[PDB]
């Protein structure tokens, strides 16, 4: 079992500092160059930093030069990324990775190992639980024997929230949408489900919202609205 495990990520204010660590497991740590690769929500991969096996050579992407510092301590199988004067644009999930490959020569060797990542969120916003509002089924939400209903999970911070329906017993026809980030700095998300309009008066529909950054759990029963 080879494994990279990142930690040290979290919510941090702009201009403040953070330090990520990456602990190796199942591999001769001193033997490979290591890298930090990050990915912002809905964006591509960006190499952040790389450091050789004995820290003899360190490199940084232009977007983090003068602010990040990469180090490693081989005697404890640990790699570090110290980030100073952080900005909102460094909001990303941060991967620890080994990416070695050589075909020189006539011998093929490669090593490609990634952690699951640690999330870094740089923002002025305060941790805050969601409000959960019904998206009620109506005639303007029926279409050919099919009705739509859902929950609006508004004004929470930071990510993530998770949404289930009837404690996971209702999964067919469910769409839980990517949150949007509003002007206020808080996130708004929608989760909808299409159901038979026949069911609207006999079946219970409850969305289960869970927001662990604030330890907020809400169960919201969604009913047709009374006109």
């Amino acid at each position: 079992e080879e494994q990279l495990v990142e930690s040290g990520g979290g919510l941090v204010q702009p201009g403040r500092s953070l330090r990520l660590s990456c602990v190796g497991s199942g591999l001769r740590f001193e033997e490979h160059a290591m890298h930090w690769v990050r990915q912002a929500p809905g964006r591509g991969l960006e190499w952040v930093s790389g450091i050789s096996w004995n820290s003899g050579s360190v490199g940084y992407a232009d977007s983090v030069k003068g602010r990040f510092t990469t180090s490693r301590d081989n005697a404890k199988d640990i790699l570090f990324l110290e980030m100073n004067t952080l900005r909102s644009e460094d909001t990303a999930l941060y991967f620890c990775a080994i990416m070695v490959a050589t075909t020189k020569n006539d011998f093929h060797y490669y090593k490609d190992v990634w952690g699951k990542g640690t999330t870094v969120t740089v923002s002025s916003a305060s941790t805050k639980g969601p409000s959960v509002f019904p998206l009620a089924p109506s005639s303007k939400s029926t279409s050919g024997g099919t009705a739509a209903l859902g929950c609006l999970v508004k004004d929470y911070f930071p990510e993530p929230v998770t949404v289930s329906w009837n404690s996971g017993a209702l999964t067919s026809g469910v769409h839980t949408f990517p949150a949007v980030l509003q002007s206020s700095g808080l996130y708004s998300l929608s989760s909808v489900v299409t159901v038979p309009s026949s069911s609207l008066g006999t079946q219970t529909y409850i969305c289960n919202v869970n927001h662990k950054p604030s330890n907020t759990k809400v169960d919201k029963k969604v009913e047709p609205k009374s006109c």
């Binding site: 409000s131 509002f133 019904p134 998206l135 009620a136 109506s138 303007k140 939400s141 279409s143 099919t146 739509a148 859902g150 609006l152 508004k154 708004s188 929608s190 909808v192 299409t194 609205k225």
Partner: peptide, 22 residues
């Protein structure tokens, strides 16, 4: 398939109105 959702009364009391189109 297009559906529109008026703001909830519960939200309205809070002072804001969110209209959702699916």
């Amino acid at each position: 398939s297009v559906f529109i959702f008026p703001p909830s009364d519960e939200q309205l009391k809070s002072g804001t109105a969110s209209v959702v189109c699916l």
